[PDB]
Design a protein around this nucleic acid. Structure first.
Lengths: 123, 60, 50
RNA sequence: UGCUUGGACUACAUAUGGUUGAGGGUUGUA
RNA sequence: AACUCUAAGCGGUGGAUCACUCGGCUCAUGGGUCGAUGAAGAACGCAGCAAACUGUGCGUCAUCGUGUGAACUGCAGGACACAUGAACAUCGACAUUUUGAACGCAUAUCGCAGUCCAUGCUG
RNA sequence: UUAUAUACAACCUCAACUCAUAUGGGACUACCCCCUGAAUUUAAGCAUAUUAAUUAGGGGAGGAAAAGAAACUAACAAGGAUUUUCUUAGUAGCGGCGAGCGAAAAGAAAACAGUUCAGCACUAAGUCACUUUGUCUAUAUGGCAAAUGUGAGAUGCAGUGUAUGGAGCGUCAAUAUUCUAGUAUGAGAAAUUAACGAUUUAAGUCCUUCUUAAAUGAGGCCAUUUACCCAUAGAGGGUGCCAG
RNA sequence: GGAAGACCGAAACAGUUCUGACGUGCAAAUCGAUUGUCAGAAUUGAGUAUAGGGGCGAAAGACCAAUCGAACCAUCUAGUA
RNA sequence: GGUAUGCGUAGAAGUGUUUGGCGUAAGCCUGCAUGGAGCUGCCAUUGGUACAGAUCUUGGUGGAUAGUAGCAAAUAAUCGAAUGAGAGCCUUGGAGGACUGAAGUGGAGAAGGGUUUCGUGUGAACAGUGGUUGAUCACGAGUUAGUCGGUCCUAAGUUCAAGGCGAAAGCGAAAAUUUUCAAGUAAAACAUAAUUUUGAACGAAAGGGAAUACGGUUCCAAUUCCGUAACCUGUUGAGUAUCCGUUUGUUAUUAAAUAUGGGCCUCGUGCUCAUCCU
RNA sequence: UGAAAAUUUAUGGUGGGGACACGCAAACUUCUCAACAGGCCGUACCAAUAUCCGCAGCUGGUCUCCAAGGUGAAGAGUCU
RNA sequence: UUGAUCAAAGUAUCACGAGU
């Protein structure tokens, strides 16, 4: 009733959250019937409110699931696909920025011999 | 007579009525409206009473 | 009919709810020049085919 | 095992590797 | 007086004219942005009152964060919990149904499975 | 060990796997790369020609692509990758020599950048990929090691080197606590520069007239050689009519 | 006894004559009487198959969606005159 | 582009007009009327720069005829009542005379349609007359399956592992070759064994195919709901040829026992022999 | 000279199992009885002189099923 | 002569034994 905020919900546990969630879907079923029955209060207009109220419970309950899956997948090669940095397809296939800059021993020997000097050919 | 989800099973509406109303059910007759809304006739057991639950939910 | 697909009753479901008058209130919105429903089909006058 | 409801998987082509293999192919030791 | 012809007045039909214009046409400039991690496209659903358009995916006219700092508005209701935030922008968190790029096999079949785990009744 | 009488170990060739990890198939369309390829037309007919080495094309990419570092030009007192523009030039040439087509070198400018292989000699595989164990931090298709754990690899991987060539020696000269490249780096008591949202509205709603529906109009505002104020702000838009 | 691409004829399928109706129709081919066949080279549905210088044709250059001595569609194309 | 220290809500453009003139003309000025926000003269330079025509384009309108051709097939209605502002309709109900005439103008399904279905209302529009009615309009409703169908099978055919071919896209493919190109089996060793050539899938609400019928019920659904009596498919459970000669019951005859016999032996108690029904 | 496959059933076969008689029994038992379950999708209505196609409430077209009495050879033609 | 056949019988040598 007093608006349930994700700023508040993030401290609550996944045990409380679904218990907090269940009293909103169970509240929402009592309002669907309250719509078709001719809700005699002008509107119990919770079905705008209590519908989006659930949507901010499912988001926090999924963020806590998704951040918790990332630290169990740190220092493991083969993260799952949906933890693998989407950027595009085009930059995903192309030569990781270390690997573009690999230098053949001809290239890192002709670099270090002759530095490009800083002159001024001026009369 | 429940308007249900369109992808509901007739084995869902058995277990989605018990879970919501503590009811044993007998036989479910499901049709899709020409609005494309699935409508389900749930006939209860004998020892329950349909009018008893109808006030309990709010179908007055 | 009487023997239709699932896909054809689902599309004929949708074309039964798009067949509506304009709500009586949206004639009154500020800058709402919706006169009538414009794309109201009619069973013997326009068929569907589509 | 009998059913229900949920999930996860099972396409082809290919590269390297792994694993089991095939051959009056080619040799070798018994 | 009928009726006809001629003119102006008045009334109708009709939408020219002129005057406008969140649209176009052209030219120029800064950019590089891309799908099997499922694209483009398609279908169908979604609002208290909605047909379309727009928006969107069971979390469904939204959306975490963040900015901004009192609205939305056709009515109704709520909100006003602005000090711990309305509505809008923004968007990096989550999410994204049936499809098409079904990735099991397939059709004007919402058809039919194989293996695996779990829940329930078997028991 | 091979009368097709069994087994072993290799290798080659080749299978299968719901094996572990990976790529592949977009769709857009203006530009770009490769193909494939007409006829309308024009010739005052028409058949080569012309359209046009083009519509339709139609496979493949990028932010550009393709090109590109001479098996080039030229004949000079010589030039020097490619691409693009100007000129050569509607020229040499091609052409039922008809209709018609049609370039380049040189010059001028834009921009300029060079290079890598294979292969004798280079005379201890000096080599890569994962694999697990640490370590290094990060969403590293990583680094440092390790077992030298498989495997690749002499049917050759690496270093050196490249047509306009070299490699070693003598050798001369200079010279060598050294610099270059790179990641961390706080550079600068935030320092500059750039982007972006900004952020300030500077200054009259000051007086009368018409609208009497509305001033944004019209008349007025000491002097400062006469102008109410600001102006690095008289761009534009909103505001009941033309608003610094 | 009950054969036959035998007979008269209903349903159907066809379309002979009236050169009847009609001919800004009821109809972009129909209405009416009169006729032709009727157990078969029969009439029909549904699924299929054949695609445009191609198909199909018991053949009329017939038919291939009111389109056929070459379908229809978009483009070349604002063809040329 | 310059200029007129131009004009303008104290009324711009436009439009009308028996306002008044100017020009030889194209044209132009001006009053009034309406109108309600922009506009002009001059000097340059320009253009998507002047309409009566094009069976011109696009919109509007006339005569005809504003009410003329016409609303004539399918035999036919008439009374009185109720409605209602209004009734030849279909509006209804009662009489009613007729038609279709079982190869119907009847009752149901296929394809097609897509809510037309059915109640409550109802103004315009539409219903080539009307309209109180309506396949219209407005708003509420409505389609219930283990047995009816699909789904399952294969037909003609789509032809579909690339062995192949083609620059590709792709292919008038009863392939005819593609290692196992197999569909496979509780099958032993030292690639489960004689084996199968085609893979793979679609393709029929008329062919093939598991099974349900009756009495009732709604404003609208019925082999689908309710009533009552059945069935098929699947899994599971419990009874069911099934205890012998003899002798436990029973002195034996018999009896449980779906049947016994057999030698031996002291009879046999001992031995031995046997049930995949008759 | 007049469909194919799914599905079904029988019988034949070698090997293997069932198989004691003082019984205890058994019986994917191809007998009888009992429990439990059966998902998805279609289902209204018109089927045409007014719901379909022919631009339309168009005399055209569009596949089937049921079928009364009379007279008569007759699902004819007239009447019901 | 409009039957029937699949899946080793025999054989030898070894396993030549295991349980016992």
């Amino acid at each position: 009733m007093v608006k349930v905020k994700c700023s508040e919900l993030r401290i609550k546990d996944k045990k409380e959250l679904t218990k907090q969630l269940d009293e909103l879907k169970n509240e929402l079923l009592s309002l669907r019937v309250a719509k078709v029955t001719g809700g005699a209060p002008s509107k119990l207009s919770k079905i705008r409110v209590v519908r989006k109220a659930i949507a901010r419970v499912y988001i926090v309950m999924h963020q806590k699931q998704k951040e918790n899956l990332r630290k169990v997948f740190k220092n493991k090669k083969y993260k799952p696909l949906d933890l693998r940095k989407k950027k595009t397809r085009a930059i995903r296939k192309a030569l990781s920025p270390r690997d573009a800059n690999r230098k053949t021993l001809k290239e890192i020997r002709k670099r270090s011999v002759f530095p490009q000097r800083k002159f001024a050919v001026k009369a | 007579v429940f308007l249900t989800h369109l992808r509901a099973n007739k084995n869902h509406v058995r277990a989605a009525v018990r879970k919501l109303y503590d009811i044993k059910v007998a036989k479910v007759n499901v049709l899709i409206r020409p609005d494309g809304q699935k409508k389900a006739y749930v006939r209860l057991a004998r020892d329950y009473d349909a009018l008893d639950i109808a006030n309990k939910i709010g179908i007055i | 009919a009487a023997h239709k697909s699932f896909r054809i009753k689902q599309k004929l479901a949708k074309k039964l709810k798009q067949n509506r008058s304009v709500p009586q209130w949206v004639r009154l919105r500020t800058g709402n020049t919706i006169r009538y429903n414009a794309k109201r089909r009619h069973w013997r006058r326009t068929k569907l085919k589509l």
